[PDB]
């Protein structure tokens, strides 16, 4: 019938960096959910408004899938109402979230010896991130009352790389996160299960 790209987003080869999270807008689908459980023993299947065990029989308009890679400690920050490094400058969920995140441990694919400095995250920003807004700009961060002209004493580069190594604790381990956000609006709906 109408297969869904959920398998595609869940099984990509490189999940994007958290500061440049990859968002896809599923619109035309049958919304099968039997294939969701068998991907991996997910570390956090926390759902925020829809019956997690029985997600069928509910029809929405669009389904947005956002792919990250974040530390284990920062997975708890991906929730409607948390504050911190990631949830203020990288990825902020709306207060009225409808959908749920799916985070699983990926250390055999997202970490190498001598560090895997291919995943970044923003730590300095002049303003907190508003919901579902991404800022990939790498402009220098002026932290002092002086016009800055590059990296120096009181002027820092915003992005800080994720050092991932196969020999780190569970909380500093590379965790792949796929956030599913459902929007419902008065419009011809297509994505939902029978």
């Amino acid at each position: 019938t109408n297969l869904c790209p959920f398998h595609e987003v869940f099984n990509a080869t490189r999940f994007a960096s958290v500061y440049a999270w990859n968002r896809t807008r599923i619109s035309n689908c049958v919304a099968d959910y039997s294939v969701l459980y068998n991907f991996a023993p997910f570390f956090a299947f926390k759902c925020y408004g829809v019956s997690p065990t029985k997600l069928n029989d509910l029809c929405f308009t669009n389904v947005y899938a956002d792919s990250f890679v974040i530390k284990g400690n920062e997975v708890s920050q991906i929730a409607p109402g948390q504050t911190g490094n990631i949830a203020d400058y990288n990825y902020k969920l709306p207060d009225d979230f409808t959908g749920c995140v799916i985070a699983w441990n990926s250390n055999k694919l997202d970490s190498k010896h001598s560090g895997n400095y291919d995943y970044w995250y923003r730590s300095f920003r002049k303003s907190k991130l508003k919901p579902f807004e991404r800022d990939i700009s790498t402009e220098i961060y002026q932290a002092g009352n002086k016009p800055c002209k590059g990296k120096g004493p009181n002027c820092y580069f915003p992005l800080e790389s994720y050092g991932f190594r196969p020999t780190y604790g569970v909380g500093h381990q590379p965790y792949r996160v796929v956030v599913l956000s459902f929007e419902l609006l008065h419009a011809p709906a297509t994505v939902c299960g029978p």
Partner: protein
């Protein structure tokens, strides 16, 4: 816009480029020690040097942010840790000279060799040769020869080097706004800017003097007992009212008296506790030892150990194909990598050492949430005390009876606990006067209170006054006996052991009160007690983000060192001792010397 926000941002950059460089360095050190090769030495070097360069540039920036315009205490502490420029204030040539002096002193101590006159080619190292020569042999002359040869062969070499080391360290300390190097060492126990919780650097000297004045009666009773036993073993070489010769203390420098147990046992017929028979009966190994100790730590409420600890840390001798140095250490590589390196054998001593090392690991895991600069013990004495209270609890007969190592038909008597307490006093009490002696001499030699021409005269005089130990042969000013110790010649503060000895018993009493323990303190155990573990974690989680006085009060309810727990621990031993010493003379005289004829 303000200095506080700039400091916050700066410390974030540091707290995140620092974790990476410390891992890449700690990992290099770990895989060098676990696998000694030359490629591994070269890796360790590059990584450590990158670490040091990072710390120096970050220190120039931290110097930039003034400390008088900061309200947050945590940021103040982090910057004060960063702003400490150390020896970089000292000029480049003098810094090179100081580094060369330190390296030469450490090297001379490391390869020290003494050759007997019977064979010039036959010489023995301090470790493990002279240690077993003078720590097991009961001959007076051989012990004297080992002591005198080691001192006359390393102290004479180390004297001018120690003079230059003192001079340049004093210059560096005076350049860093300290009165002398001893003040720099005492700067760790210094906390300022808190109402009622401040601790000046001279307050440490005053406190240690008061605690030693309190400790002295127990030590002198123990010394009288030990002198009586040795005089029984050495009939014509020790005066009943004199002082013990420095080489008759069971160790190279007299630091520990544990080797006197065979000579000074209270009751020689009572079997001593030993679970090694049960270890070889039940075929225990390193994995079982560490699993049992982990289960003990869980019983008090502290969490499990990370899976990475079991996966990669080596707990056993890795054959002979690759050599590994395995002095028992607890590595906190950072970012969650907590590992342990020690060669475990089936022995009760290794069992208690595993308990101590995993107590260290528990401490490291507790404050993992603190920023990088504050991920350490509150002072230099907390880590060892926290590690050692676990070994104290793990050696109790109730604990070993619960595990099944001791048969339940074991008979616990007063003589057995007297023997245990005497062994503890030999190990624990016997080193407090020596530690205080050594640190006091180092303070008074760094401060310029004693002239160079009387380094040794004053040293021996105040050793006979404090420890009650005289030299077997007169020494001129050419010798450098204090420099012959490992810690003195490698620039290590020594009062950390004194403070650890006090803090460990303070913590033990505080925890045993919370474990609703009944009876003597030396029998107490904290296993199967969630309240005691919660109380200990309440201080362990702090790290050094708060003054060590507050961390100490959070457990014991006091803001300073007190000695009453130490005597409360040794009360039965103290009573037995002072009952035995009724026919012996306590105290000592400083006039008597072995060579005075």
């Amino acid at each position: 816009s303000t200095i506080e926000e700039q400091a916050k941002t700066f410390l974030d950059k540091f707290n995140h480029e620092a974790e990476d460089l410390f891992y890449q360095s700690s990992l290099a050190s770990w895989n060098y020690n676990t696998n000694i090769t030359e490629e591994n030495v070269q890796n360790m070097n590059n990584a450590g040097d990158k670490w040091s360069a990072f710390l120096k540039e970050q220190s120039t920036l931290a110097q930039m942010y003034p400390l008088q315009e900061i309200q947050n205490l945590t940021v103040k502490l982090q910057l004060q840790a960063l702003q400490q420029n150390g020896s970089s204030v000292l000029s480049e040539d003098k810094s090179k000279r100081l580094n060369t002096i330190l390296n030469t002193m450490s090297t001379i101590y490391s390869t020290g060799k003494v050759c007997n006159p019977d064979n010039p080619q036959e010489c023995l190292l301090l470790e493990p040769g002279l240690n077993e020569i003078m720590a097991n042999s009961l001959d007076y002359n051989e012990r004297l020869w080992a002591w005198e040869s080691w001192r006359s062969e390393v102290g004479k070499q180390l004297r001018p080097l120690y003079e230059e080391y003192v001079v340049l360290k004093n210059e560096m300390a005076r350049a860093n706004h300290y009165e002398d190097y001893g003040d720099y060492w005492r700067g760790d126990y210094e906390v300022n800017g808190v109402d009622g919780y401040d601790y000046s650097r001279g307050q440490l000297i005053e406190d240690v003097e008061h605690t030693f004045e309190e400790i002295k009666p127990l030590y002198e009773h123990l010394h009288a007992y030990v002198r009586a036993k040795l005089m029984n073993a050495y009939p014509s070489y020790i005066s009943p009212i004199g002082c013990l010769p420095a080489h008759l203390l069971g160790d190279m420098w007299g630091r520990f008296w544990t080797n006197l147990y065979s000579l000074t046992v209270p009751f020689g017929q009572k079997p001593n506790i030993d679970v090694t028979d049960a270890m070889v009966d039940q075929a225990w190994d390193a994995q079982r030892i560490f699993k049992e100790a982990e289960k003990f730590f869980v019983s008090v409420g502290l969490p499990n150990m990370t899976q990475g600890f079991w996966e990669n840390s080596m707990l056993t001798d890795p054959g002979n194909v690759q050599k590994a140095v395995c002095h028992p250490t607890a590595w906190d590589l950072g970012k969650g990598d907590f590992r342990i390196l020690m060669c475990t054998k089936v022995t009760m001593d290794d069992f208690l050492t595993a308990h101590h090392e995993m107590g260290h690991i528990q401490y490291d895991m507790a404050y993992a949430a603190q920023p990088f600069l504050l991920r350490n013990g509150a002072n230099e004495g907390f880590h060892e005390a926290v590690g050692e209270i676990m070994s104290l609890s793990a050696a109790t007969p109730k604990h070993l009876k619960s595990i099944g190592l001791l048969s339940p038909d074991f008979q616990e008597d007063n003589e057995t606990e007297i023997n245990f307490l005497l062994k503890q006093a030999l190990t624990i009490v016997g080193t407090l006067p020596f530690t205080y002696m050594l640190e006091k001499w180092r303070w008074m030699v760094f401060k310029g209170e004693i002239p160079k021409d009387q380094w040794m005269k004053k040293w021996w005089e105040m050793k006979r006054e404090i420890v009650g130990v005289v030299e077997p042969v007169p020494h001129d000013e050419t010798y450098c006996d204090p420099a012959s110790l490992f810690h003195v010649s490698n620039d290590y503060s020594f009062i950390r052991y004194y403070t650890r000895t006090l803090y460990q018993f303070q913590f033990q009493e505080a925890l045993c009160q919370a474990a609703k323990h009944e009876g003597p303190l030396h029998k107490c155990d904290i296993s199967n007690s969630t309240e005691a573990g919660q109380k200990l974690f309440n201080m362990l989680r702090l790290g050094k983000s708060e003054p060590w006085t507050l961390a100490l009060e959070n457990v014991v309810g006091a803001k300073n060192m007190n000695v009453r727990p130490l005597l409360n621990y040794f009360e039965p031993l103290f009573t037995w001792l002072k009952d035995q010493n009724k026919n012996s003379f306590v105290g000592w005289s400083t006039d008597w010397s072995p060579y005075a004829d």
